[PDB]
Amino acid sequence: TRKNSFIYNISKKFSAITGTYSDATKRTIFAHISHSINIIDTSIPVSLWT
Amino acid sequence: IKRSNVFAVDSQIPTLYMPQYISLSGVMTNDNQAIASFEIRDQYITALNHLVLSLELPEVKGMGRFGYVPYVGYKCINHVSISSCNGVIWEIEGEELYNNCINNTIALKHSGYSSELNDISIGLTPNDTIKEPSTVYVYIKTPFDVEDTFSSLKLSDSKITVTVTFNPVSDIVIRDSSFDFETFNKEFVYVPELSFIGYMVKNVQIKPSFIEKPRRVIGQINQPTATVTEVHAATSLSVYTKPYYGNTDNKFISYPGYSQDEKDYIDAYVSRLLDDLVIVSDGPPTGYPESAEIVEVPEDGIVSIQDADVYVKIDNVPDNMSVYLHTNLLMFGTRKNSFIYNISKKFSAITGTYSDATKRTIFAHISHSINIIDTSIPVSLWTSQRNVYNGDNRSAESKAKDLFINDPFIKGIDFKNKTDIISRLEVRFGNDVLYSENGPISRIYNELLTKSNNGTRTLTFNFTPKIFFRPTTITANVSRGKDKLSVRVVYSTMDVNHPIYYVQKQLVVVCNDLYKVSYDQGVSITKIM
Amino acid sequence: TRKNSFIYNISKKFSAITGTYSDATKRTIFAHISHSINIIDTSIPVSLWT
């Protein structure tokens, strides 16, 4: 809400991302993920981000 | 305002009694059906209820794949009868006993439901132990259990006999062809023990009671009709269908073992199909019948199978090897150039990774349309005379992993009783129509009222409390001819080119008759007229 | 309280500082000051800053 204060960043809620790239399907197949996402984030409407 | 006190009670002093747990060993007699008899004669046992049957399953040694069906304790029971000197007091079939206990999760668990009993275990050497000895407990729910001591069976100085008839051991065992079932069957013997709660009552004051006894009628193969005669006071009526696998060898492609969800059945089936569906090989794969159509997967990963596009992408394929797709793994059709049932066309996306160390494809995500009916097709039906194709194009290796399954309590046409094959039901009391329906609203009602998940189509005529009232029944009118219940159904129409169309069906009608229980000159029951 | 979040900085509460340097006393004599200091800041104990 303020230009140079606290920010809510969905990227900072991840701590470890591991996986394997697939050459055949040209995708990353993710294995273990360490994160702090909770139910409120899944419940945010897309309109409220913008 | 005279107010009823809802903060205090006047405690009644009950009849003086003492309960005791009592175990009995039986007398076993024997295609030689095994029968256990238990004799209860004890002057100080005034009443009893809560019968539990103990069964010791032995150690299973040898080679092959072996497992027990879920709820093996219930499924080994063919018939239970309680008798006195005046005749049978109460009896039931194993199917109906299991039906009455289907909502008791604790009882189902005690009768043998675990990974140790129900996984399909593998024996590698003739001395390998496939299963360890174990004991299961079967709660034989009787009408004498509903209201504890109020509904108990009183032994009016009479000798009570409990007789248990057992199913053959092939009914409770899931096995492959590699297991030596002939020797296992020659050696297996049921070792039963009977337990009950007895009551030593001081100055018991006995009154006559009422009891409901199930009566079961099975229709002839594929007939849409069945009738129960001599109906004078029924409290309920239930109707369901059973599959008749007698025209088959009872062999199926997969079984999920201890996992018993529909998703689990489908996953086991897909897992068994993937080893022959997608092949990573050096040149055209070998070892498949001549009717097999193995095509190479192009650079875009899409194979077309007559209006169907399968997307195959495998990682880490060696440079000397290619990816192949089986386009007609299982095929069925009745006319030569018409519609075909092809298990390969039910897949849309197959991805995985090849393992150089184990020389296998480890599959990751699969997109498919396999349902429970496919997992429920018998292997004999893929290769029946009516199939104009070679139905089974699997490898010999996967053909050798089919399982014999002889479970006696299967309803419907699939393992889960998920598809309803009854599109219309009509019941007649005499000649008049008593009930009619097209959807399964009576099954919805049975499940809602009994708080069950596996209800059947049921007409219940009794809504009064159990033992403190005389039950409400539909009463016969022999003058008007209303003394029999006739059931006619219309089966759901299946496609003639689906193999499940040729599974044979029987209609089962169960009727609960009302009996009076009197206690002069021992115990006796009389059918209410 | 957190390393990379909001900070309370007494310096950011000033907007305009004017004055004149004195060569004789070697001090800055301040004239007009524009600020947002309130009574709570004058009431903070020095121990609470550290």
Swiss-Prot record, chain B:
<comment type="function">
    <text>Scaffold protein which forms a transitory spherical honeycomb lattice providing curvature and rigidity to the convex membrane of crescent and immature virions (IV). This association occurs concomitantly with viral membrane formation. Targeted by the drug rifampicin, which prevents the formation of this lattice, and hence virus morphogenesis. In the presence of rifampicin, irregularly shaped membranes that lack the honeycomb layer accumulate around areas of electron-dense viroplasm.</text>
</comment>
<protein>
    <recommendedName>
        <fullName>Scaffold protein OPG125</fullName>
    </recommendedName>
</protein>
<dbReference type="Pfam" id="PF03340">
    <property type="entry name" value="Pox_Rif"/>
</dbReference>
<dbReference type="GO" id="GO:0016020">
    <property type="term" value="C:membrane"/>
</dbReference>
<keyword id="KW-0472">Membrane</keyword>
<dbReference type="GO" id="GO:0046677">
    <property type="term" value="P:response to antibiotic"/>
</dbReference>
<keyword id="KW-0426">Late protein</keyword>
<comment type="subunit">
    <text>Homotrimer. Self-assembles to form a layer. Interacts with OPG158 (via N-terminus); this interaction is necessary for OPG125 association with membranes.</text>
</comment>
<dbReference type="InterPro" id="IPR005008">
    <property type="entry name" value="Poxvirus_Rif-R"/>
</dbReference>
<dbReference type="GO" id="GO:0042802">
    <property type="term" value="F:identical protein binding"/>
</dbReference>
<comment type="similarity">
    <text>Belongs to the orthopoxvirus protein OPG125 family.</text>
</comment>
